[PDB]
Ligand binder design. Structure first.
Ligand code: SF4
Length: 208
């Protein structure tokens, strides 16, 4: 039950931070995961985006947003004229949490508890201290609550620029849906979910 804090080194070097996250024992999730999935991008990024946790594909690659949700994220970024390669993209929890299907190898993603999110939050703080983003997009409720408190309501602040204490640099925060949700439902449901995410990404990119 320790939390990640005493496993986080005092450095802004992202490769050093990523290796240290591989050695983190701040919660139980390191055990069955393949590896840490640290954030991806350069310190030169001025927009950071934060999801929930790895999926199966992310866990195998050691990279964020490489599966189907990442594909739809990329499509929405393109619609918002945002270059993904200029971003820093990461997740609130850095080890894949899952159960195995009975009788097989298939891994079923399971959502981190609030305790696991808080345990892993010091890595987000180190990432923000390193990258110094102007704006942070919180992709989904888990990432939003990680910075804005466990009773934060994404539905009550769509399109709003937020700020909160204990976030390095006091960046603009924009809380939106997680891109996995854009995979759901028939044509018009997907198209409305897409539009809503694009609107929020544009708010974030237009912060000046
Ligand atoms: S999930 Fe986060 S806190 Fe838990 S072990 Fe992995 S890095 Fe450490």
């Amino acid at each position: 039950m320790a939390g990640a804090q005493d496993f986080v080194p005092h450095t802004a070097d992202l490769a050093e931070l990523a290796a240290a996250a591989g050695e983190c024992r701040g919660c139980g999730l390191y055990r069955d995961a393949t590896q840490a999935v640290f954030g991806a991008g350069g310190r030169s990024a001025r927009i950071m985006m934060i999801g929930e946790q790895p999926g199966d594909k992310e866990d195998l690659a050691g990279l964020p947003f490489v599966g189907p949700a990442g594909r739809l994220l990329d499509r929405a970024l393109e619609a918002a004229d945002i270059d993904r390669d200029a971003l820093y993209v990461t997740n609130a929890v850095k080890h894949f949490k899952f159960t195995r299907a009975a009788g097989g190898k298939r891994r079923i993603e399971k959502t981190p508890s609030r305790t696991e999110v808080v345990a892993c939050r010091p890595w987000l703080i180190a990432e923000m201290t390193s990258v110094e983003p102007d704006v942070v997009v919180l992709l989904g409720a888990t990432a939003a609550k990680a910075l804005l408190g466990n009773d934060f309501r994404v539905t009550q602040h769509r399109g709003e620029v937020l700020h909160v204490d204990d976030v390095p640099g006091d960046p603009a925060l924009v809380a939106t849906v997680h891109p996995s949700s854009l995979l759901r439902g028939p044509k018009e449901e997907r198209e409305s979910a897409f539009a809503g995410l694009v609107d929020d990404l544009r708010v974030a990119a237009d912060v000046r």
